[PDB]
Amino acid sequence: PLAKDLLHPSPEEEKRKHKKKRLVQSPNSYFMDVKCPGCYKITTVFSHAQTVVLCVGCSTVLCQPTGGKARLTEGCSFRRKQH
Amino acid sequence: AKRTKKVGIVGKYGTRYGASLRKMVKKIEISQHAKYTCSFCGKTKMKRRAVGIWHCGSCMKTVAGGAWTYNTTSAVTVKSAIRRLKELKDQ
């Protein structure tokens, strides 16, 4: 394809492309509100967190660090931050 | 300045006894007259008294060791083997 529109790529290929190789760099990570059952406060957690995030009001772990993304403990709820 | 190119400690033997024999006795004499770190007091004051006898100046500890070195590799492997056989013998 000699006439690919490099200026305006559609979001499908914009997302399939590597983070650095996009037209403008965009991180693949995000921030999430996390709810621990039996607790009221809301924890802001990085999606690719490298540390065990703990609640200050309960001796419970929220996420476990993995290779790519922090695995949330079962029973915990989560939502995105502003897409 | 550097006083000898290669003979080092066996410069006291002059031109005698043959180059290969002087080279052979050089490392043995260096290890013989070296001061080793005492494993009891931690000081570098463990030196040979007689053949096989190594005395520390500070803690006055006398150890049975090798002829020219504080311990021989044979004896080290022996000690490790005896420890392994003891821990295998008991449970």
Partner: protein, 150 residues
Amino acid sequence: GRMHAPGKGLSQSALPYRRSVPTWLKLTSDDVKEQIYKLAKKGLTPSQIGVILRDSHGVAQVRFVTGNKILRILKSKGLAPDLPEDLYHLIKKAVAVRKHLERNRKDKDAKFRLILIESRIHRLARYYKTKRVLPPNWKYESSTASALVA
């Protein structure tokens, strides 16, 4: 490519185009500064401080939210480490490799890695002496470096 490896990896961090602080961040500049102060007193290096702050407290960039970098804040308060973090870790690695090597004399691979690490140490020390972070007479000695780390 890597300085001392034949690797050409691309794993990096893609900082977003939006430099603005997110609206859901309730931490103020002084609050983040106090958190950095507490973590530095606990003994964390600036990389670990940033990691903890991003993972737990939801702050994306300390520079974006406060206007200053973590090392700048620590140096302004007066509790920045005497050695730079990366130089300290390089010296720590060199000490560990030397400690392994003095027992494993046949580990020629370890000797090669030690040469690579010490070359990196000397290049980084040259850079820091050029930038006057380090004293002009600062020198890495293999014998006396063990007392500087851990």
